[PDB]
Structure 1
Amino acid sequence: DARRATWWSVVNILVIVYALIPVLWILSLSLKPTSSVKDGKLIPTEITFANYKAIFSGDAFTSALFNSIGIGLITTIIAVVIGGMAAYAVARLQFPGKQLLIGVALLIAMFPHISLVTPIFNMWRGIGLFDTWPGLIIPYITFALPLAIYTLSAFFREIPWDLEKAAKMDGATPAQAFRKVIAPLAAPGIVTAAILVFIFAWNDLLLALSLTATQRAITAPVAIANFTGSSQFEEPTGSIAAGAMVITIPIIIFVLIFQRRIVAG
């Protein structure tokens, strides 16, 4: 019905612009000339690259970016590999207390990280470590795993084991060709989990402040969280905005291409 199609069309276009407007305000602010930034008008007149050039010049962002992407990727793989070893037990199998095993797993990712910040500094996380990739990785893993398990559990309920019964009819061996179809069955779940947990992990600010040390062992969130313009004498905002746009976009353009298997998940 064309009336209801207009009603669709308006809600479709309004909701996307609602989602997008903050980034427009950010981006436009970073393009507008120094003189014009104080103007209340959204209109991006008389654009300049100078802020962006002032980010690209000097390693200030790019170092902490290279930190961030490494710690993200490695934190992803180790969480999901441990996750995928365990998910079978809870969501293809049964064992005593398994309902309480998930009963804690759903909780123990989502802690108020402020409670956990202080002991690790006072432990060998700030003592036996501090300026080190392991020192920051260990807490990321602490929050990654129970999400990985929780999400993988859903992504294992959605598959009946009946196909493996037919598999032991066409050949009864453990792993081998059975792994060579059960892994193809599982793989879309693995990558959907790997995406969401990467993004979540990359999304921390607290420990990313409270234990990180220098351009070796500082992540990009911490960098932009303390960066304050490449000139002291210009208002920092245009540079801050240019850096913010620059650092939030790359993960966005990555994950949006990869949306398929997580929108399936």
Structure 2
Amino acid sequence: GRLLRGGFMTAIYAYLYIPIIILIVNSFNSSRFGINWQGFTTKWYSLLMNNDSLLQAAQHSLTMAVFSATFATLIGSLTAVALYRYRFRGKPFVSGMLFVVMMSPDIVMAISLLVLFMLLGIQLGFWSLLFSHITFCLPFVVVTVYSRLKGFDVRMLEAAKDLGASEFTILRKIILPLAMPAVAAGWVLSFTLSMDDVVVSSFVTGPSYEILPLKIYSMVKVGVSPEVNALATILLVLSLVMVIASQLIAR
């Protein structure tokens, strides 16, 4: 009984991790189309450390993901709380715009927003990318937090109001910890959405704010060298060490 459950969980983990090991191994092959092993080499890493035009793409993408995810989770959490508890004139109008965003073919957005920014005078670059990375990634956090909020126990809210609790403090202390997993899920989902975007950013960016996925997609002409595998291994190692530090230090 325990054995079957473990087999299921390890089967899914294998399904999600067995290509990553292949990429890590092929980061050391000598073939530029890794389908077979042709020797052990470290040429690709030395090439990467000297490229000085792909590293900046990684840094820009990381900063974009962090800032976009933080503001998106904050605004989405406040939106979900507002829809569930607060009372104002029109909620259906607010709800419908999120659905329209979730159904935009991702090509029409990159043109409508581009025309809008030129009309408004916003310079293309950091700010234009952020204002488009927050707009989407919003329905996902709104939906998650609204799903978590439903079924809430109003006895706690009533007791907190009875003891004296302004909206800010009751929100924070009573609702934020009791709905924390939804917030964390929203943060990670927003982070992973702000790294695979290639269509909106290619239009709403400017001459110098190049990001990493654009480079990978444009390498399709000359073939994708194991350089990007070397970059992916480094980023994976950083992600793993960050959490093995966070868990061990405090919790």
- What is the aligned counterpart of 2:66 among 51, 73, 80? 73
Q: Kindly provide the CA deviation profile for residues 114-157 of structure 1, in whole angstroms up to 9, marking residues without a partner as x.
A: 01222333343598346421121222122122223222212322
What letter is aligned with 1:134? Answer: W
Partner of 1:263: none
What letter is aligned with 2:18? Answer: I
What letter is aligned with 1:23? Answer: I
Query: Does residue 210 of structure 1 match 2:207?
Result: no
SS in 2 for 1:22: helix
SS in 2 for 1:31: coil
The change in CA–CA distance for 1:228 and 1:127 in structure 2 (over 3 A counts) is farther
Shift in Å, 1:186: 4.2
Q: Kindly provide the CA deviation profile for residues 241-265 of structure 1, in whole angstroms up to 9, marking residues without a partner as x.
A: 3335445x2685389779x9xxxxx
**Structure 2 Cα separation of the partners of residues 100 and 126 of structure 1:** 25
Partner of 1:237: 225
Query: Does residue 57 of structure 1 match 2:45?
Result: no
Q: Percent identity, please.
A: 20
**Structure 1 Cα separation of the partners of residues 178 and 33 of structure 2:** 55
Q: Is the 8 A contact 1:102 1:150 kept in 2?
A: no
Shift in Å, 1:23: 2.3
What letter is aligned with 2:199? Answer: L
Query: Does residue 26 of structure 1 match 2:23?
Result: yes
- What is the aligned counterpart of 2:164 among 154, 172, 192? 172
Partner of 1:16: 13
The change in CA–CA distance for 1:131 and 1:52 in structure 2 (over 3 A counts) is farther
Q: Is the 8 A contact 1:120 1:126 kept in 2?
A: no
**Structure 2 Cα separation of the partners of residues 177 and 10 of structure 1:** 45
**Structure 2 Cα separation of the partners of residues 39 and 66 of structure 1:** 27
Q: How is 1:137-216 mapped onto 2 (pairs within 5 angstroms)?
A: 137-169=130-162, 171-175=163-167, 178-179=170-171, 181-182=173-174, 183-214=176-207, 216=208
SS in 1 for 2:127: helix
Q: Kindly provide the CA deviation profile for residues 197-231 of structure 1, in whole angstroms up to 9, marking residues without a partner as x.
A: 122122312123233344x41112123333589xx
**Structure 1 Cα separation of the partners of residues 39 and 59 of structure 2:** 32
**TM (normalized to structure 2)?**
0.77
Q: How is 1:37-52 mapped onto 2 (pairs within 5 angstroms)?
A: 40-41=35-36, 46-52=39-45
Partner of 2:212: 220
RMSD of aligned alpha carbons = 3.6
Query: How many residue pairs align between the two structures?
Result: 245
**TM (normalized to structure 1)?**
0.74
Shift in Å, 1:51: 0.4
Shift in Å, 1:64: 1.1
Q: Greater shift after overlay, 190-199 or 66-75?
A: 190-199
Q: Is the 8 A contact 1:51 1:239 kept in 2?
A: yes
SS in 2 for 1:47: coil
Q: Is the 8 A contact 2:110 2:201 kept in 1?
A: no
